[PDB]
Amino acid sequence: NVPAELKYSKEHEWLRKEADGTYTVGITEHAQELLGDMVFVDLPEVGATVSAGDDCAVAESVKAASDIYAPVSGEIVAVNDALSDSPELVNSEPYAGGWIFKIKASDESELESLLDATAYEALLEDE
Ligand SMILES: [Ca+2]
Ligand SMILES: [Cl-]
């Protein structure tokens, strides 16, 4: 399950441009499958300024945990508070209700450092 329109990181995040011009970030179907049943998501602080590649959230399952990185630089403008209660949304709806945070990008040329869907599919086959 690799939505054809998203951009992806090598750390298994996806990035979606929204109608308000901000970007939504979550983890992929593959990511949630690797982690298994979700227990806790540590969300970033709204208002925080991050550089592309900064660690800004953590996903923890019954068995494992991974850092989650800003795919682009910018300002965190929203976080999915639903995950505090229902982190399992990351398992059931990784591209939808399980989104993690939203960023107002400071340099959109950074999109060029992300993978397109076909590259992410290739990455999965090499893992
Ligand atoms: Ca936090
Ligand atoms: Cl989904």
Curated annotation (Swiss-Prot):
Required cofactor names: (R)-lipoate
UniProt remark on cofactor binding: Binds 1 lipoyl cofactor covalently.
Residues found modified as N6-lipoyllysine: 63
Cited SUPFAM superfamilies: Single hybrid motif
GO cellular component: a single term: glycine cleavage complex
GO biological process: glycine decarboxylation via glycine cleavage system; one-carbon metabolic process
Keywords: Lipoyl
Residue stretches making up the Lipoyl-binding domain: 22-104
Highest taxon in the source lineage: Bacteria
Function, as annotated: The glycine cleavage system catalyzes the degradation of glycine. The H protein shuttles the methylamine group of glycine from the P protein to the T protein.
Family matches, as HAMAP family: GcvH (MF_00272)
PANTHER family on file: GLYCINE CLEAVAGE SYSTEM H PROTEIN, GLYCINE CLEAVAGE SYSTEM H PROTEIN-RELATED
Similarity annotation: Belongs to the GcvH family.
Record text on subunit structure and interactions: The glycine cleavage system is composed of four proteins: P, T, L and H.
Name under which the protein is recorded: Glycine cleavage system H protein
Phylogenetic classification of the source organism: Bacteria, Pseudomonadati, Pseudomonadota, Gammaproteobacteria, Enterobacterales
Gene responsible for this protein: gcvH
